[PDB]
Amino acid sequence: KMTEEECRGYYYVYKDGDPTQMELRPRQWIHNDFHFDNVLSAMMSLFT
Amino acid sequence: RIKPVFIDDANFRRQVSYQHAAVHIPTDIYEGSTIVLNELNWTSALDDVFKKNREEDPSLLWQVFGSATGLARYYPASPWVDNSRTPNKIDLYDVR
Amino acid sequence: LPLFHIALLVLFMVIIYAIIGLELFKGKMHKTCYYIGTDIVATVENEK
Amino acid sequence: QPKPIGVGIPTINLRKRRPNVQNPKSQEPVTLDFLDAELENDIKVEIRN
Ligand SMILES: *[C@@H]1O[C@H](CO)[C@@H](O[C@@H]2O[C@H](CO)[C@@H](O[C@@H]3O[C@H](CO)[C@@H](O)[C@H](O)[C@@H]3O)[C@H](O)[C@H]2NC(C)=O)[C@H](O)[C@H]1NC(C)=O
């Protein structure tokens, strides 16, 4: 899912990459903890 | 959403409602998107013909429309055998 | 060339600490908890 | 019978099945041939044909 409006609902995760072992998780639009949205966040990311 | 009465009826080993039709949407398909929501109204006109077919032949079983978008509108209305994640078990049912 | 003595000191310290660890923690990290009746290691989301 | 059609010897490996994975059950149809529902003769083959 490539858009925020697309990233809604639930989806399957597979444990150890086995197609017969799946678990439901809700999908959420996630922002990276260290980003470059403004100069302050960019400076924090560059310091890290 | 709709809360049906769900009387218990024979020829269906479960509780069914004849006042409307039930809609099944696959778990990994988000209900409420533009494609799914557009399908729901134009498929909502099938309930009248579902009721007409039922009343013409009372001994008639499930009538289903399986959409190319993944939806499945079936009559009479009845809860799904395996709901999504209310219990630990999940269902993998795609009408396509 | 002048770093030869420091290299010898580092090598000797590595040897000493390796032998100490060999005597202390040998055969200790061979036990983990799997799921009961299976051979699948039991972990959580972000735990190695 | 309402039972699904079996294929081969059923082999399971319970040492790699987690208790909470919800494996799929089945989707196959009950396709039982006429010659496999009764004892088969040569007359039955020609009748079926
Ligand atoms: C999907 O939803 C839309 C909107 O809820 C449905 O359109 C609505 O259809 C009803 C009846 O066909 C309309 O009611 C009528 O409104 C006129 C005035 O426009 C009034 O003179 C009539 O007496 C009657 O009350 C309603 O206005 C209309 N809404 C809109 C926004 O157009 C649509 O029918 C639904 N899909 C299907 C397949 O039914």
Swiss-Prot record, chain C:
The chain crosses the membrane at residues 4-25. It comes from the Eukaryota. It is found in: Cell membrane, Sarcolemma, T-tubule. Phosphorylated. Phosphorylation by PKA activates the calcium channel. Both the minor and major forms are phosphorylated in vitro by PKA. Detected in skeletal muscle T-tubules (at protein level). Each of the four internal repeats contains five hydrophobic transmembrane segments (S1, S2, S3, S5, S6) and one positively charged transmembrane segment (S4). S4 segments probably represent the voltage-sensor and are characterized by a series of positively charged amino acids at every third position. Pore-forming, alpha-1S subunit of the voltage-gated calcium channel that gives rise to L-type calcium currents in skeletal muscle. Calcium channels containing the alpha-1S subunit play an important role in excitation-contraction coupling in skeletal muscle via their interaction with RYR1, which triggers Ca(2+) release from the sarcplasmic reticulum and ultimately results in muscle contraction. Long-lasting (L-type) calcium channels belong to the 'high-voltage activated' (HVA) group. Belongs to the calcium channel alpha-1 subunit (TC 1.A.1.11) family. CACNA1S subfamily. Component of a calcium channel complex consisting of a pore-forming alpha subunit (CACNA1S) and the ancillary subunits CACNB1 or CACNB2, CACNG1 and CACNA2D1. The channel complex contains alpha, beta, gamma and delta subunits in a 1:1:1:1 ratio, i.e. it contains either CACNB1 or CACNB2. CACNA1S channel activity is modulated by the auxiliary subunits (CACNB1 or CACNB2, CACNG1 and CACNA2D1). Interacts with DYSF and JSRP1. Interacts with RYR1. Interacts with STAC, STAC2 and STAC3 (via their SH3 domains). Interaction with STAC3 promotes expression at the cell membrane. This is Voltage-dependent L-type calcium channel subunit alpha-1S. It comes from Oryctolagus cuniculus. The lineage of its organism: Eukaryota, Metazoa, Chordata, Craniata, Vertebrata. The chain holds residues 194 to 241 of 1873 of the full protein.
From Swiss-Prot, chain D:
Skeletal muscle. Proteolytically processed into subunits alpha-2-1 and delta-1 that are disulfide-linked. It is found in: Membrane; Cell membrane. The alpha-2/delta subunit of voltage-dependent calcium channels regulates calcium current density and activation/inactivation kinetics of the calcium channel. Plays an important role in excitation-contraction coupling. Belongs to the calcium channel subunit alpha-2/delta family. Dimer formed of alpha-2-1 and delta-1 chains; disulfide-linked. Voltage-dependent calcium channels are multisubunit complexes, consisting of alpha-1 (CACNA1), alpha-2 (CACNA2D), beta (CACNB) and delta (CACNA2D) subunits in a 1:1:1:1 ratio. Binds gabapentin, an antiepileptic drug. The MIDAS-like motif in the VWFA domain binds divalent metal cations and is required to promote trafficking of the alpha-1 (CACNA1) subunit to the plasma membrane by an integrin-like switch. This is Voltage-dependent calcium channel subunit alpha-2/delta-1. It comes from Oryctolagus cuniculus. The lineage of its organism: Eukaryota, Metazoa, Chordata, Craniata, Vertebrata. The gene is CACNA2D1.
